[model samples]
Target: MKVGFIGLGIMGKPMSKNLLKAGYSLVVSDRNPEAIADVIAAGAETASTAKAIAEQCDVIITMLPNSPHVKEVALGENGIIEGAKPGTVLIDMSSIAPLASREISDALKAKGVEMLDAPVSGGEPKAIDGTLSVMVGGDKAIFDKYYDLMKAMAGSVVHTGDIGAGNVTKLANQVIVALNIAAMSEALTLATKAGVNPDLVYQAIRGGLAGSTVLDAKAPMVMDRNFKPGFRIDLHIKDLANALDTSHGVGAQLPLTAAVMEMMQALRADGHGNDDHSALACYYEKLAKVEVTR
Candidate 1:
């Protein structure tokens, strides 16, 4: 299938390459000239605009940063909706608000274009390896039609529900992830301050009730003090804010999520916004006056 991929940032770049490697004819575009050049060199064609990509492709995938960017690329004056054909499908894989996903999908549906709000998890490592988990919210028929194409970039492709459910799921996912990191940080800091080795604590508990994918993946980063972004603190702050907004709109209270949101903001205030989420440990370490490293 002919695919159009926009937003070739950290995740999108690798994802577009994976599509090409999977034998899909690709037309890709991005704000970064270098990113565009890289994808073009990988056998994908270049489009001058989202409109141009829409004009030329059967399926369009957008992996931009947030709702506004996705809206601009999919609905702006020179956006994809202006040039897409009646049956062209748009799959947005950005982590944004659920309402924004519905808004974009509704606007595209008015123009006979089908859309899926298919946010992803697993960060840059998974994006590079094409093992990211994809949560899709759209028409089941459309999802089924593009399953194999999505498989080119996802290890888990699940249709959560209609319209905005995928992002709702993603927001829930962010809440759990943030709190898990916070819980892990708090526990490790307590261990470090009380004269126990944090590394040994992790080794002891990681095989028991404390073992989790997040613990295994992020604990090592904390132990090594690697603050490089697999997923940025600023980006996660956005997701938590979205989750909080959604929670309020649904008459739900998210005190835990709200607390973690502030923690991430505190990290941002300290100029570590670009650091990985594992830096939640750094926040705890500052308070505990101890470093949980080897």
Candidate 2:
């Protein structure tokens, strides 16, 4: 299938590269000339707009930042809907609200274009490595049809349910990841402030009940004070806001998530918005008056 990819930022660029590496024919675009140049150097042809991409490709994938961007690219004047032929597939791999996912899917469905909310996890490292965990929602048959295409960029591909469920799952994923990082921050800072070696503490419990993917992936970053973003604090803030909104809409309460949201906001305000989510440890560091670095 001829593929078109839009939003070639940190994640999108690497994902498109992996698809190209896997031998898919690609027509890609981005607002950044440098990003576009990078993809073109890797053998992707360029398109001027999302509509143009849709006009030419069998499948168009968007990895935008949020819901509004996705809407603008997929449904706005020069958007995908304008040029998409009937039966074209649109896979949105960006994380946004479930309601937004459903709404976009409905609009595309009306255009006779199929959609899947296929958000991912594991940050930029995973995106670069082509091992992102893909959570998909839409028609199961379509998912099965394009399963191999998705597999080119994902370590695991799961069809959670109908259109919005993939994002719902992603929101749940954010909540768990945010809280896990926060918990690690709080507990490890306590260990450090109390004069225990936080690294040793991590090693001692990592194989037991407290072990987790989040801890394993984020702890080393936290300890090294490598605040460089694999996923930015602002992005997690966006996901948390979506999580809180979804929770409120569903009559669910997320006190811990709310707390982490505030922590992220504080980090952003302190000029760490561009830092990795692991910089969440900084909040605890300030509160405990101790840096949890080696």
Candidate 3:
């Protein structure tokens, strides 16, 4: 099937490449000239705007950053809705507010277009390896039809519930992930402050109940002092902000999520916003007055 892909940032670039590797024809759009050119070099075509991409492709996949950006691309002047055919499906893989997803889906529906809120997890590494988990919310039939297409860039694709459920699941995922990082940072900082090597501490608990995908993935990065952006701290902050806002709407309490959100905010204020979420360790390290490096 012909596909149109938008947003060639850290996640979208590799994802579009995987679609090309799977032999799907692609028309891609992005504001960045370098991003557009790089994907064009990968044998995919380019579109000057989301509208143009929509005109040429059967399915359009958008991996934008957040809710407003997605809205602007899908419903703005000369946006996807302006050029989409009646039967077109738009798969938005960006992590955004569930309510925003529903609103966008409604707008698309009015135009005889179909939409799926299909946010993803696993960050840039999994995006590169095509093992990211995709949570989808939309019509079951449409989801089934695009299962393989989504699988071309994911390890697993799960249909959640309805139009906004995918992003709901994603927000929950972000909650757990953020809390896990915070807890791990707290533990490792304690070890370092007590004169123990935090790296060895990680090795000791990694196979135990304290171990987790979050620990295994981020602890080494913390110890090695590699704060590169696999997933930036600011992005995590955005996810947590969404989580808190969504929770408040549902009358749910997320005390721990709020706490970690503040910690990430402090990290961002210190100019580590572009650092990896693993840099959460730096927050704890700062409080303890000792770095967590080995």
Candidate 4:
């Protein structure tokens, strides 16, 4: 497969590397010069822009952090759309709003291009391992063509329905995982305040019915006070807001999502925005005037 990948950030870098390793002819571009160099070293060709990438590759994949970046790179000046010929497949792996995905799909279709929303769930680690879960919404035929390539980037790839459905599914995924993280924070916080070890709590519940990948991955980070961007708090806060916008636009009721978004917002306000999402639990430590770490 001739693949052109854009947005070579934390997740994008690794996802593209896997493609290079899989023996795909990968052409990559990023505003970050260092990102382009690393991928080129990994045997992927580096393109100058999305337009140049689109002009050459059969499939163009974008793994941007948010909607704005993805939209701009695809539609803005020097965008792939401007240089694309008909039948080009554009896959957006960024987590954007459902309405926006559908809107972009409409625009792409007018130019004889096909758009797929294949937002992923697993963060950097899974992205590096190519074990992310992919939620796709687009033409069934389009998905069929790219399904194998998506498999290279994900442990699970489900064609949700049509354009924008993947975003909706991804929002549902965020709501579930975010709520679980909020619960994990509350759980470990209670344990910490009551003189119980949070790691012990993690060990106890890690495989029990209450256990979840979110708890397993995030609880330890919270326990060690290791606030790094496995997934950044601010980006998660952005995702939570995206979920709220999607829910509100479609008249969906999501009280838990709203509540979690507020809690994450509160953490952001306290200057923990760039911390790991797991560090959301630490906001309580700030409030209680005690440290959660040993």
Candidate 5:
């Protein structure tokens, strides 16, 4: 398959690497030159613009930050949409609103192109391993045509109906992650306040039903004061907002999501928005006024 990929930030970089390893010919473009350094070395040709990727490849994949970026890459003047051929497939792996994804797909269809909203989970680790879980919303027949290539990037790739379903499914996944991260911060900090060993609590609960990959990924960043940006705090804040917005639009009341989003808002207001999301544990410490170290 001749594939074009844009955005090579944390997850995007590894994801394209997996495609290279799968032996697909790749065309990549990114505004950040540093992001595509390794990909170019791995045998992918670098393109100068979104339109270039569209004009050059059979399949184009986009993984951007949010809704605005997604739109810019797909529909902006000189973007992929302008150069896309009728038979080309545009797959968006960005975390964006389902409604927006549908709208974009409709626009692309008008230009005689097929579009798919295929949001992904499993972050960088799974991106490297090519075992990410993908939620797709588009024509099943189209998805089936690219199944093996999609499988090279995910552990499970599900076709969720028409063009926006993938995003709603992704929101559902984000709700679980944001709430759990907040809950983890609170639980560990509360353990400290209650004179329980945080490590002991983690160990005790880790093997039980309460254990989670979210916890495993973030807990230490809390105790060790490591606020590096595997996933930036603002993006987490954005995802939480995305979840809440999607829930509200669908007439679903998510009180938990509301509370967690409020906490994230406070974190953003405090200027920690740019910190790594794992720094959420530190937010609990900020709330508790006591060291919640391991």
Candidate 6:
């Protein structure tokens, strides 16, 4: 099937490349000239607008930043809704608010276009390797139809439930991931303050019940103070904000998530907004007045 991809940023760029590698014809668009140019060089055609992308492709995927941007690109003037044929399917892989996903899906349904809120996990490393896990929420038949297309860019693709459930699952994933980073930061800070090598503590606990993907992925980066943006603190802030709002609307209590949200906000305030979520360590390090180093 011909696929159109929009929002070719860090995750979107690699994802679009994987679709090309899988031998799918791709039409890509992005606000960034450099992002569009790089993907075009990888052998994909370009569309000037989201509407144009919809006009040309059967399946259109958006990996944008947040809810508002997705809404604008999919429903605004000259948007996907303007040009999509009746049977077209839209897979929004951006991590956005679940309610917003539902609203978008409803709007698309009015136009006889199907939509899947298919958000992803595993960040830039997995996006590069095409091993990111995708959580999809939509009609089972629609999901089955596009399963292979998603598999081109993901290691796993699960249909969580009806529309918006995928983003609910993603919010849960974000909550756990944020709290994992906070817990790791707290333990390592305590190790550092006690004059023990935090790396050794990480090694000791990593084989125990304390071991986790987050621990394994982030502990070394924390020790070496590498705050590069595999996933930015600012983005985590956005996820947590959405999580909090969703939880409130659903009457769920997320005390730990709320605490970590503040920690990330502090990091943002300190000008580390662009740093990796691993920089949760910096919040602890600041409080303890000790950097966790190898």
Which regions in candidate 3 have their CA more than 4 angstroms from the true location? none
lDDT of model 3 at residue 261?
90
Q: What does candidate 1 score on TM?
A: 0.97
lDDT of 3 by residue, 1-294 (tens): 779999999999999999999999999989798999999999899878899999999899999989999999999988999999899999999999899999999999999999999999987888999999999999999999999999999999999999999999999999999999889999889988998998899989999999898898898888889999888989888889999999999999999999999898899999999999999988888888999887
Clash pairs for candidate 1: none
The runs of at least 3 residues in candidate 4 whose Cα sits more than 4 Å from the true structure, single-residue gaps closed, are none
Candidate 1: tens digits of C-alpha lDDT, residues 181-265? 9999999999889999988999999999888878998999999989898889999999999999998899998999999888888
TM-score (all chains, Cα) for each model: 0.97, 0.97, 0.98, 0.96, 0.96, 0.98
Stretches of model 2 off by over 4 angstroms after superposition: none
User: In candidate 4, what are the lDDT values of residues 10-86, reduced to their tens digit?
Assistant: 88899998887777899889988999999999998877778888999878999887877888988888898987889
| Residue-by-residue lDDT tens digits, candidate 2, 1-294 | 889999899899999999999999999989898999999999999988889999999899899999999999999989999999999999999998999999998998898999999999988888999999999999999999989999999899999999988999999999999999999999999999999999999999899999998888989898888989788999899999999999898899899999899989899889889998999999999989998876
lDDT of 6 by residue, 1-294 (tens): 789999899899999999999999999999899999999999999888899999999999999989999999999988999999999999999999999999999999999999999999987888999999999999999999999999989999999999999999999999999999899999999988998999889889999999998999899898888989888999889999999999899899999999999888788999999998999999999999999998
How many residue pairs clash per model? Answer: 0, 0, 0, 0, 0, 0
Model 3's alpha-carbon lDDT is 0.93
C-alpha RMSD between model 4 and the true structure: 1.3
CA error at residue 13 for candidate 2, angstroms: 1.4
Report per-prediction Cα RMSD to one decimal.
1.1, 1.1, 1.0, 1.3, 1.3, 1.0
Q: Check candidate 5 and list the clashing pairs.
A: none
Cα deviation in Å at residue 173, candidate 5? 0.5
The 10 consecutive residues of candidate 5 with the worst lDDT sum are: 276-285
**Candidate lDDT (C-alpha), each:** 0.92, 0.93, 0.93, 0.85, 0.85, 0.93
Winner of 1 and 5 under TM-score: 1
- In the predicted model 2, the residue pairs found to clash are none
The candidate, 2 or 4, that scores higher on lDDT is 2
Clashing pairs in 6: none
